[PDB]
């Protein structure tokens, strides 16, 4: 979904956010979106810190050379469940970003690349309680301070100071590296978190007239029909008032994420395998909208009939239009043997908004979009290059997951009279599940290869209901056994 | 050394090298003198000031003047 969101400058940026599954056995989905987008937002929940899928997607993020941006979500669990005081909340938040930064350091080489190191002072980390309806960065917070208190400084140099072991001296209205008194807290706890805690408990322990006075103190004025809602709805409305439009997100990513002009260049340089001396790689490297359209269709999405799959991919070169002819370059495409590619048409191109589709008459270079009429030859991913190009053509490298389909199951349709649609189901399953693998043996039965419990679970569900409607008996699961050596053979074997 | 402009003005005052200041829309007339004071409105209290009319190259001694900032164009050092 790409949303037209606002900056502090009022300049609206179009942000293509791709909501991913976070359960481990769905890492397949992840890599697709990650090879789609040049930037990533890692949402680490303030409460439980780092977990498996977080840092595994972090390795995914550094391997594919991405703009990694930290979103500390669920900060309210600090206030309400754990009830950790503002100071220990500073410690826990700091420790979570420190854990992300150090597990970046591990794989990036034990040192933190200076354009990659996440700390809020330069505005990469942003805090979130999405449920309670608010999120910010120190930028957004400092700017908010400037707005409510009168135009009395540059919010930039403020956010420069609100983080760290900085302690505000009431003595002279300046921040210090040293605790001016005995017991004073940091600048973050006080100037950020003390207000947040006060906001939370002026909602979650106090008369709605106390809330209306606590915010009529501040400029924000509610509607006296918002001081009726329960503790969670009133909490959301009150924080969304004095934490407003999420500018931390736009003014975070649109800063720490390059646009399409620069993203496609390294995208292909590390992602294209065909010769980069050709004009096509340079047409991408400018993201020139007028050149030979090169699209990297890395995901396909089934529809309301479950007959054909729209093709989600990034138009990174040229300008597509509904009604084109293209050679869709599949998986095993070869410059010497063009067996594995199909010429096809474009029906209609959209922009996807996660509940509906918007028809888009032209698909700009650098725009991730939904294409109609291409699925017949796409199994996992492909490239799109117009037939209007008479140049040698190659493909974007397939997805190199973090995970492997280590688990295998057997599949025998209860009725053999429907094994065609069964495999067609399996076939159409090989449509939507990047890590799905269908393998036929000397035994002849179709074994299917997934990450583990939930991935095979939901693939069996969608096989049962989405594509085939033929109910199939699956034996006990079993996994793949490799075959290694202990120590070398004592004799040289001949054939 | 990426130094603040106000620190260069501190330089101009305490070093008391004689400088030339250009005036607003005044390509005909410059003012040389030694900076002995200034504010954040950067009106310049100047010693030994003489005003240069370059076209005939005539220099008019004014002495200790207080130059209005609102006419200031350029603070250049009259060094060799």
């Amino acid at each position: 979904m790409s949303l037209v969101m606002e900056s502090h400058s009022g300049k609206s940026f179009l942000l293509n956010l791709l909501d991913c599954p976070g359960h481990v056995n769905f890492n397949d989905e992840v890599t697709a979106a990650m090879r789609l987008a040049d930037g990533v937002m890692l949402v680490v929940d303030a409460a439980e810190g780092i977990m498996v899928v977080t840092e595994r997607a972090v390795r995914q993020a550094l391997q594919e050379g991405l703009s990694i941006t930290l979103m500390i979500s669920k900060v309210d669990r600090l206030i309400t469940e754990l009830k950790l005081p503002p100071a220990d909340a500073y410690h826990k938040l700091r420790h979570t970003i420190e854990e992300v930064n150090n597990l970046i350091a591990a794989c990036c080489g034990g040192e933190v690349p200076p354009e990659q190191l996440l700390d809020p002072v330069r505005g990469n980390v942003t805090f979130s309680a999405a449920q309670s309806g608010w999120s910010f960065s120190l930028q957004s917070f400092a700017r908010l301070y400037a707005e409510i208190y009168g135009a009395g400084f540059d919010p930039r140099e403020f956010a420069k100071r609100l983080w760290g072991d900085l302690y505000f001296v009431p003595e002279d209205r300046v921040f210090r590296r040293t605790p001016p008194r005995a017991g004073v807290e940091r600048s973050f706890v006080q100037f950020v978190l003390e207000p947040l805690y006060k906001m939370y408990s002026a909602v979650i322990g106090e008369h709605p007239k106390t809330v209306e006075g606590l915010l009529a103190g501040l400029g924000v004025y509610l509607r006296t029909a918002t001081y009726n809602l329960d503790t969670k709805p009133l909490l959301k409305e009150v924080c969304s008032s004095v934490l407003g439009s999420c500018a931390g997100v736009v003014d975070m990513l649109v800063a720490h994420v390059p646009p399409s002009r620069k993203a496609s260049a390294d995208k292909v340089a590390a992602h294209y395998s065909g010769p980069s001396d050709a004009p096509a790689v340079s047409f991408m490297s400018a993201c020139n909208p007028r050149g030979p359209l090169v699209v990297a269709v890395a995901k396909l999405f089934p529809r309301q009939d479950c007959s054909r799959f729209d093709a989600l991919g990034r138009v990174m070169s040229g300008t597509l239009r509904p009604g084109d002819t293209v050679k869709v370059l599949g998986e095993a495409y070869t410059p010497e043997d063009e067996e594995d590619s199909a010429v096809a048409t474009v029906g209609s191109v959209w922009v996807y908004q996660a509940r509906y589709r918007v028809p888009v008459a032209r698909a700009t270079a650098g725009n991730l979009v939904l294409i109609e009429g291409v699925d017949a030859t796409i199994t996992r991913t492909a490239t799109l290059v117009s037939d209007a190009y008479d140049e040698p053509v190659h493909i974007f490298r397939p997805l190199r997951f973090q995970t492997r389909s280590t688990v295998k199951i057997a599949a025998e349709p209860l009725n053999p009279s429907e094994l065609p649609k069964m495999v067609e189901g399996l076939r159409k399953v090989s449509k939507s599940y990047p890590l799905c693998s269908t393998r036929v043996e000397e035994s002849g039965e179709h074994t299917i290869f997934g990450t583990g419990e939930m991935y095979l679970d939901c693939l069996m569900k969608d096989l049962r209901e989405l594509y085939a409607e033929v109910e199939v008996k699956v034996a006990d699961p079993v996994v793949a056994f490799c075959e290694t050596v202990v120590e070398s053979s004592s004799l040289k074997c001949f054939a | 050394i990426m130094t603040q402009p106000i620190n260069l003005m501190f330089r101009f005052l305490q070093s008391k090298q004689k400088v030339q200041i250009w005036l607003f829309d005044q390509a005909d007339l410059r003012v040389e003198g030694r900076i002995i004071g200034f504010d954040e409105y950067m009106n310049l209290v100047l010693d030994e000031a003489e005003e240069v009319s370059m076209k005939r190259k005539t220099r008019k001694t004014l002495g200790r003047i207080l130059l209005k900032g609102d006419n200031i164009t350029l603070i250049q050092t009259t060094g060799r």
Partner: protein
């Protein structure tokens, strides 16, 4: 301000009554005062050293790079 993207770079600064001074930037203010190193008067062909220009004394600035 975007003058921050210019730090320590050779510039061409145009001023009131059609004047050009070209010098590597040294710093600026909110009032857009500019301090320059090795500034050259392009009219009379003179390198005028380190300078400060006033805010409304800045019509435009170009980056020769």
């Amino acid at each position: 301000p975007e003058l921050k993207r210019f730090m320590d770079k050779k510039l061409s600064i145009t001023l009131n009554a059609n004047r050009h001074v070209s010098g590597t930037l040294r710093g600026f203010d909110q009032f857009m005062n500019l301090v320059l190193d090795a500034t050259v008067d392009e009219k009379l062909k003179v390198d005028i050293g380190m300078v400060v220009i006033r805010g409304n004394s800045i019509q435009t600035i170009e980056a020769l790079e």
